[PDB]
Amino acid sequence: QVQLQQPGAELVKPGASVKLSCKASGYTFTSDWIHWVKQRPGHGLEWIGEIIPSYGRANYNEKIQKKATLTADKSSSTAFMQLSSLTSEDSAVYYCARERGDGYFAVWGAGTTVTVSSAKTTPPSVYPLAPGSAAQTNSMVTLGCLVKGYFPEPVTVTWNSGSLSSGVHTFPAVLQSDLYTLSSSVTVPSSSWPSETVTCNVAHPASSTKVDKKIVPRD
Amino acid sequence: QVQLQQPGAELVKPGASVKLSCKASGYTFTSDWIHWVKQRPGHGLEWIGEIIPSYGRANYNEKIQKKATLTADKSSSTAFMQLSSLTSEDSAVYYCARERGDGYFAVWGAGTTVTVSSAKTTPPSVYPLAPGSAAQTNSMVTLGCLVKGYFPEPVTVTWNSGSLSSGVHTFPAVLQSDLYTLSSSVTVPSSSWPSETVTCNVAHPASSTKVDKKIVPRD
Amino acid sequence: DILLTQSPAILSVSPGERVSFSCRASQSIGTDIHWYQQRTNGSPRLLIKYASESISGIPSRFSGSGSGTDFTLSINSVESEDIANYYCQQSNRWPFTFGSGTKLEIKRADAAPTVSIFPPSSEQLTSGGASVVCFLNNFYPKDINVKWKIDGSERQNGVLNSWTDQDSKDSTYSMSSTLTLTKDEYERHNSYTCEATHKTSTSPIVKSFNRN
Amino acid sequence: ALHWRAAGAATVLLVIVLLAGSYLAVLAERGAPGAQLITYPRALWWSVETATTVGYGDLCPVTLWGRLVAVVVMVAGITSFGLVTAALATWFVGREQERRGH
Ligand SMILES: *SCC1=CC(C)(C)N(O)C1(C)C
Ligand SMILES: [K+]
Ligand SMILES: [K+]
Ligand SMILES: [K+]
Ligand SMILES: [K+]
Ligand SMILES: [K+]
């Protein structure tokens, strides 16, 4: 079972501060350390610091400006990272990982996407994409769904709630005036549609809004 | 309070020898070491040697010619550096510093400027600098004072005995026939002068002569 | 004996930006490195000890990091008061040694010089001399030219100049130009002018005065 | 009881030797190029290192007097700890006699 649970996204205004969490389950020893790693888009992994819960001590990366403050709640098995006075530099994906005191990160969390913008949260509008009445077909058919007008990132597009993995492409979002846009595409055998349903599920954490939208042929 | 006190300047004739002092106050432990550092104009810091007062042992830099001899007076808390047969190479600012046996120089002295010349000590003549009767003004006014005909260096120019810090520039002296020359400048709001007095204090250690000179508008 | 390398020797950064000073040791010395700050005319002052330990009375702005052979001194958000020379010092092995140093340099907006011309003092003439001082204050960049004219004609003799290092109050530069003549030489002339040519103006900034 | 006074006396003496050894080591090593035993805090850790005979190799003297100081530390440490062992024997031997009547 998912060993480390982290919120999908956090929106923060320049100067403000946010507090990320990391809920742990599974085996827990007094010799455990929770780590926090920062990753900026297109870049690599940057170690932020560690916390020893059973005792409560924390150490931090000495080369980078210290914008973090680590704490832990022994009872609820939750590690917290306090980021303060955030700027555009601080936007990135923050992962937490668990090390059993033997030096390597056994398990990582899904990571929390943090965004430092002055903009406002905006859920995405999801529109269908069925072929045109004049579009011929082979043995395969391509359908997809459009997610636009949302902020901040990210969005998780699934097909038939994961049951449909192969054939899926979710293009990287694009920014245009405080609003992102992206499309996901799926491909199933033509003979199977629309006899067998095909729906796209779109989740957007920053607004706690997950929505569905079935893909049916045009009238 | 000033932990290490050192004389401002020493004039020495090529071949002769001088003895610099460093008076210490504040906490003094048996684990203290007094250090001496040499700095030539425009260049960096050069370690000369160390003395352990509570015992009296001294070690010296092995790469540079040994022209120093360190001693200490336990009773008056004073460390002494004996420089002998000095040449133009030896002219520089000599700092003394105190290390508590943990490797770093906690406190440094103001340093003693040593000059090895055949010339003679000469106190500086200080002349005023008030704008000309035809010089217009804005919200600020610029006054200053001229220090010339002195030797050896240095001279410490202050305004209103330090009470006037901001707005001050003391240009680097210039040498012309065994005599240095430099000017200091100050800027106060025009409305405040000369209703509020403005004087320049010039101290010249090599001659133990400090003098003042008020700056008043021309007749 | 341990050699501490400091490169680059000069560092130019803009107001509020983050700057980093490098110090490398010719062999591993743990965290036995210390940093010193030294402003123009002042004595060195401990900034960080043991590579990363804070000293009391030093802006929280200053930090340090590293271990072994590579050390860094960082200033988060620089500011004019930080213009100076920075030295590292090691205490791992005898004798203690210093780095050659790194000069910090701020890049601010252009500033035209505030020019001032001063006639010689009565106290000075009263002794056979006469010095006409001219100040080119708080300008930037540092490049500037000063020209002297006596009664319309350019003068070049008895003219000694002096430039200050980047000021720690506002990151500007200042220059002093001095024309020294004997009272006699000074007497048989009327107007003295001081001209400053600087990047901020295609036209020279001028200041003069008549001996009467 | 002698064996207990001695033990204690041996412990206060060892602490003296350590402190004096930290001081004397730095005095001896400073001045010798490449020497590492030159600041008091670590020198003190080194003396403890030596007296207990653990000798890690992260620090050690290189001058004649430094080494000589090192030998007094080793010997004071070995002797001191050896005396505790000896006092524990007198305690056991004494108690084992009581348990047998004598
Ligand atoms: S014993 C400590 C020591 C001695 C020497 C051979 C000089 N070293 O390089 C180390 C620091 C290991
Ligand atoms: K052993
Ligand atoms: K051993
Ligand atoms: K060993
Ligand atoms: K060993
Ligand atoms: K043994």
PDB file of N, CA and C in Angstrom, chain A residues 98-147:
ATOM      1  N   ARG A  98      11.550   8.059   2.363  1.00  0.00           N
ATOM      2  CA  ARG A  98      11.884   7.435   3.624  1.00  0.00           C
ATOM      3  C   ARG A  98      13.152   6.619   3.463  1.00  0.00           C
ATOM      4  N   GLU A  99      14.097   6.835   4.376  1.00  0.00           N
ATOM      5  CA  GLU A  99      15.365   6.122   4.394  1.00  0.00           C
ATOM      6  C   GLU A  99      15.432   5.430   5.745  1.00  0.00           C
ATOM      7  N   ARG A 100      15.819   4.157   5.741  1.00  0.00           N
ATOM      8  CA  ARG A 100      15.906   3.381   6.971  1.00  0.00           C
ATOM      9  C   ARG A 100      17.263   3.524   7.637  1.00  0.00           C
ATOM     10  N   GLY A 101      17.884   4.685   7.512  1.00  0.00           N
ATOM     11  CA  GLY A 101      19.171   4.880   8.147  1.00  0.00           C
ATOM     12  C   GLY A 101      20.298   4.073   7.537  1.00  0.00           C
ATOM     13  N   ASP A 102      20.106   3.594   6.317  1.00  0.00           N
ATOM     14  CA  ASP A 102      21.159   2.859   5.634  1.00  0.00           C
ATOM     15  C   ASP A 102      21.531   3.582   4.348  1.00  0.00           C
ATOM     16  N   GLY A 103      21.138   4.856   4.260  1.00  0.00           N
ATOM     17  CA  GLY A 103      21.513   5.692   3.134  1.00  0.00           C
ATOM     18  C   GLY A 103      20.801   5.782   1.802  1.00  0.00           C
ATOM     19  N   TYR A 104      19.766   4.994   1.569  1.00  0.00           N
ATOM     20  CA  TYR A 104      19.113   5.081   0.274  1.00  0.00           C
ATOM     21  C   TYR A 104      17.624   5.234   0.437  1.00  0.00           C
ATOM     22  N   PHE A 105      17.022   5.944  -0.502  1.00  0.00           N
ATOM     23  CA  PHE A 105      15.604   6.209  -0.445  1.00  0.00           C
ATOM     24  C   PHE A 105      14.767   5.058  -0.966  1.00  0.00           C
ATOM     25  N   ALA A 106      14.346   4.234  -0.022  1.00  0.00           N
ATOM     26  CA  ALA A 106      13.538   3.064  -0.290  1.00  0.00           C
ATOM     27  C   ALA A 106      12.250   3.413  -1.027  1.00  0.00           C
ATOM     28  N   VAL A 107      11.534   4.408  -0.518  1.00  0.00           N
ATOM     29  CA  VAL A 107      10.276   4.797  -1.117  1.00  0.00           C
ATOM     30  C   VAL A 107      10.102   6.302  -1.198  1.00  0.00           C
ATOM     31  N   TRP A 108       9.491   6.756  -2.286  1.00  0.00           N
ATOM     32  CA  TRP A 108       9.239   8.174  -2.495  1.00  0.00           C
ATOM     33  C   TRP A 108       7.743   8.426  -2.568  1.00  0.00           C
ATOM     34  N   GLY A 109       7.344   9.661  -2.272  1.00  0.00           N
ATOM     35  CA  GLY A 109       5.946  10.041  -2.367  1.00  0.00           C
ATOM     36  C   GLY A 109       5.661  10.486  -3.806  1.00  0.00           C
ATOM     37  N   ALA A 110       4.394  10.625  -4.159  1.00  0.00           N
ATOM     38  CA  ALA A 110       4.038  11.041  -5.511  1.00  0.00           C
ATOM     39  C   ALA A 110       4.515  12.469  -5.771  1.00  0.00           C
ATOM     40  N   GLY A 111       4.802  13.184  -4.690  1.00  0.00           N
ATOM     41  CA  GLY A 111       5.263  14.553  -4.800  1.00  0.00           C
ATOM     42  C   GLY A 111       4.144  15.567  -4.890  1.00  0.00           C
ATOM     43  N   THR A 112       4.366  16.742  -4.311  1.00  0.00           N
ATOM     44  CA  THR A 112       3.407  17.846  -4.310  1.00  0.00           C
ATOM     45  C   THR A 112       3.891  18.969  -5.224  1.00  0.00           C
ATOM     46  N   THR A 113       3.114  19.307  -6.249  1.00  0.00           N
ATOM     47  CA  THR A 113       3.504  20.382  -7.155  1.00  0.00           C
ATOM     48  C   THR A 113       3.179  21.724  -6.507  1.00  0.00           C
ATOM     49  N   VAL A 114       4.205  22.525  -6.261  1.00  0.00           N
ATOM     50  CA  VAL A 114       3.986  23.823  -5.656  1.00  0.00           C
ATOM     51  C   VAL A 114       4.110  24.890  -6.730  1.00  0.00           C
ATOM     52  N   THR A 115       3.217  25.870  -6.682  1.00  0.00           N
ATOM     53  CA  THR A 115       3.219  26.961  -7.647  1.00  0.00           C
ATOM     54  C   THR A 115       3.136  28.290  -6.913  1.00  0.00           C
ATOM     55  N   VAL A 116       4.114  29.154  -7.164  1.00  0.00           N
ATOM     56  CA  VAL A 116       4.152  30.468  -6.544  1.00  0.00           C
ATOM     57  C   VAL A 116       3.770  31.498  -7.595  1.00  0.00           C
ATOM     58  N   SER A 117       2.490  31.845  -7.622  1.00  0.00           N
ATOM     59  CA  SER A 117       1.972  32.811  -8.585  1.00  0.00           C
ATOM     60  C   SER A 117       0.982  33.735  -7.876  1.00  0.00           C
ATOM     61  N   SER A 118       0.665  34.865  -8.495  1.00  0.00           N
ATOM     62  CA  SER A 118      -0.282  35.795  -7.889  1.00  0.00           C
ATOM     63  C   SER A 118      -1.674  35.498  -8.434  1.00  0.00           C
ATOM     64  N   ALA A 119      -1.722  34.628  -9.440  1.00  0.00           N
ATOM     65  CA  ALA A 119      -2.969  34.245 -10.084  1.00  0.00           C
ATOM     66  C   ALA A 119      -3.951  33.562  -9.140  1.00  0.00           C
ATOM     67  N   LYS A 120      -5.049  33.070  -9.707  1.00  0.00           N
ATOM     68  CA  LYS A 120      -6.094  32.404  -8.933  1.00  0.00           C
ATOM     69  C   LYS A 120      -6.387  30.995  -9.431  1.00  0.00           C
ATOM     70  N   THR A 121      -6.772  30.131  -8.503  1.00  0.00           N
ATOM     71  CA  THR A 121      -7.096  28.755  -8.833  1.00  0.00           C
ATOM     72  C   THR A 121      -8.274  28.746  -9.801  1.00  0.00           C
ATOM     73  N   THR A 122      -8.226  27.854 -10.784  1.00  0.00           N
ATOM     74  CA  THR A 122      -9.285  27.749 -11.780  1.00  0.00           C
ATOM     75  C   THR A 122      -9.401  26.319 -12.274  1.00  0.00           C
ATOM     76  N   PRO A 123     -10.540  25.670 -12.002  1.00  0.00           N
ATOM     77  CA  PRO A 123     -10.732  24.292 -12.445  1.00  0.00           C
ATOM     78  C   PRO A 123     -10.775  24.250 -13.964  1.00  0.00           C
ATOM     79  N   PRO A 124     -10.417  23.103 -14.550  1.00  0.00           N
ATOM     80  CA  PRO A 124     -10.405  22.912 -16.002  1.00  0.00           C
ATOM     81  C   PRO A 124     -11.750  22.537 -16.639  1.00  0.00           C
ATOM     82  N   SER A 125     -11.956  22.980 -17.876  1.00  0.00           N
ATOM     83  CA  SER A 125     -13.169  22.651 -18.622  1.00  0.00           C
ATOM     84  C   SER A 125     -12.769  21.524 -19.567  1.00  0.00           C
ATOM     85  N   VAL A 126     -13.460  20.393 -19.468  1.00  0.00           N
ATOM     86  CA  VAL A 126     -13.145  19.225 -20.293  1.00  0.00           C
ATOM     87  C   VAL A 126     -14.135  18.990 -21.442  1.00  0.00           C
ATOM     88  N   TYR A 127     -13.631  19.063 -22.671  1.00  0.00           N
ATOM     89  CA  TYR A 127     -14.453  18.869 -23.858  1.00  0.00           C
ATOM     90  C   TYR A 127     -14.045  17.604 -24.611  1.00  0.00           C
ATOM     91  N   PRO A 128     -15.023  16.893 -25.193  1.00  0.00           N
ATOM     92  CA  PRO A 128     -14.779  15.655 -25.946  1.00  0.00           C
ATOM     93  C   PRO A 128     -14.113  15.869 -27.299  1.00  0.00           C
ATOM     94  N   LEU A 129     -13.624  14.777 -27.877  1.00  0.00           N
ATOM     95  CA  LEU A 129     -12.973  14.807 -29.180  1.00  0.00           C
ATOM     96  C   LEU A 129     -13.282  13.524 -29.928  1.00  0.00           C
ATOM     97  N   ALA A 130     -14.372  13.537 -30.686  1.00  0.00           N
ATOM     98  CA  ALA A 130     -14.769  12.377 -31.465  1.00  0.00           C
ATOM     99  C   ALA A 130     -14.436  12.691 -32.910  1.00  0.00           C
ATOM    100  N   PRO A 131     -14.070  11.669 -33.694  1.00  0.00           N
ATOM    101  CA  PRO A 131     -13.728  11.896 -35.100  1.00  0.00           C
ATOM    102  C   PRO A 131     -14.851  12.629 -35.814  1.00  0.00           C
ATOM    103  N   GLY A 132     -14.553  13.168 -36.995  1.00  0.00           N
ATOM    104  CA  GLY A 132     -15.568  13.857 -37.776  1.00  0.00           C
ATOM    105  C   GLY A 132     -16.332  12.847 -38.621  1.00  0.00           C
ATOM    106  N   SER A 133     -17.586  13.153 -38.929  1.00  0.00           N
ATOM    107  CA  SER A 133     -18.417  12.251 -39.717  1.00  0.00           C
ATOM    108  C   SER A 133     -17.779  11.836 -41.048  1.00  0.00           C
ATOM    109  N   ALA A 134     -16.782  12.595 -41.499  1.00  0.00           N
ATOM    110  CA  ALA A 134     -16.113  12.306 -42.766  1.00  0.00           C
ATOM    111  C   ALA A 134     -14.780  11.587 -42.597  1.00  0.00           C
ATOM    112  N   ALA A 135     -14.419  11.302 -41.351  1.00  0.00           N
ATOM    113  CA  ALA A 135     -13.167  10.617 -41.063  1.00  0.00           C
ATOM    114  C   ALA A 135     -13.318   9.108 -41.170  1.00  0.00           C
ATOM    115  N   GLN A 136     -12.627   8.509 -42.135  1.00  0.00           N
ATOM    116  CA  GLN A 136     -12.672   7.064 -42.319  1.00  0.00           C
ATOM    117  C   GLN A 136     -11.930   6.419 -41.157  1.00  0.00           C
ATOM    118  N   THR A 137     -11.867   5.092 -41.139  1.00  0.00           N
ATOM    119  CA  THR A 137     -11.166   4.398 -40.063  1.00  0.00           C
ATOM    120  C   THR A 137     -10.575   3.065 -40.508  1.00  0.00           C
ATOM    121  N   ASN A 138      -9.582   2.597 -39.762  1.00  0.00           N
ATOM    122  CA  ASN A 138      -8.919   1.332 -40.056  1.00  0.00           C
ATOM    123  C   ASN A 138      -9.400   0.299 -39.045  1.00  0.00           C
ATOM    124  N   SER A 139      -8.453  -0.265 -38.307  1.00  0.00           N
ATOM    125  CA  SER A 139      -8.765  -1.250 -37.289  1.00  0.00           C
ATOM    126  C   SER A 139      -8.720  -0.535 -35.945  1.00  0.00           C
ATOM    127  N   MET A 140      -8.144   0.665 -35.950  1.00  0.00           N
ATOM    128  CA  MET A 140      -8.024   1.472 -34.742  1.00  0.00           C
ATOM    129  C   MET A 140      -8.739   2.806 -34.892  1.00  0.00           C
ATOM    130  N   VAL A 141      -9.165   3.359 -33.765  1.00  0.00           N
ATOM    131  CA  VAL A 141      -9.843   4.648 -33.736  1.00  0.00           C
ATOM    132  C   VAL A 141      -9.173   5.514 -32.664  1.00  0.00           C
ATOM    133  N   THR A 142      -9.054   6.804 -32.938  1.00  0.00           N
ATOM    134  CA  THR A 142      -8.415   7.708 -31.999  1.00  0.00           C
ATOM    135  C   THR A 142      -9.396   8.729 -31.444  1.00  0.00           C
ATOM    136  N   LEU A 143      -9.539   8.730 -30.126  1.00  0.00           N
ATOM    137  CA  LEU A 143     -10.423   9.655 -29.448  1.00  0.00           C
ATOM    138  C   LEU A 143      -9.558  10.355 -28.411  1.00  0.00           C
ATOM    139  N   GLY A 144     -10.066  11.444 -27.846  1.00  0.00           N
ATOM    140  CA  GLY A 144      -9.314  12.154 -26.833  1.00  0.00           C
ATOM    141  C   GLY A 144     -10.176  13.181 -26.136  1.00  0.00           C
ATOM    142  N   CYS A 145      -9.610  13.921 -25.189  1.00  0.00           N
ATOM    143  CA  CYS A 145     -10.384  14.948 -24.517  1.00  0.00           C
ATOM    144  C   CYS A 145      -9.509  16.153 -24.182  1.00  0.00           C
ATOM    145  N   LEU A 146     -10.102  17.337 -24.325  1.00  0.00           N
ATOM    146  CA  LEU A 146      -9.443  18.622 -24.107  1.00  0.00           C
ATOM    147  C   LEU A 146      -9.641  19.224 -22.718  1.00  0.00           C
ATOM    148  N   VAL A 147      -8.531  19.537 -22.060  1.00  0.00           N
ATOM    149  CA  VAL A 147      -8.564  20.125 -20.732  1.00  0.00           C
ATOM    150  C   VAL A 147      -7.942  21.501 -20.878  1.00  0.00           C
TER     151      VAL A 147
END
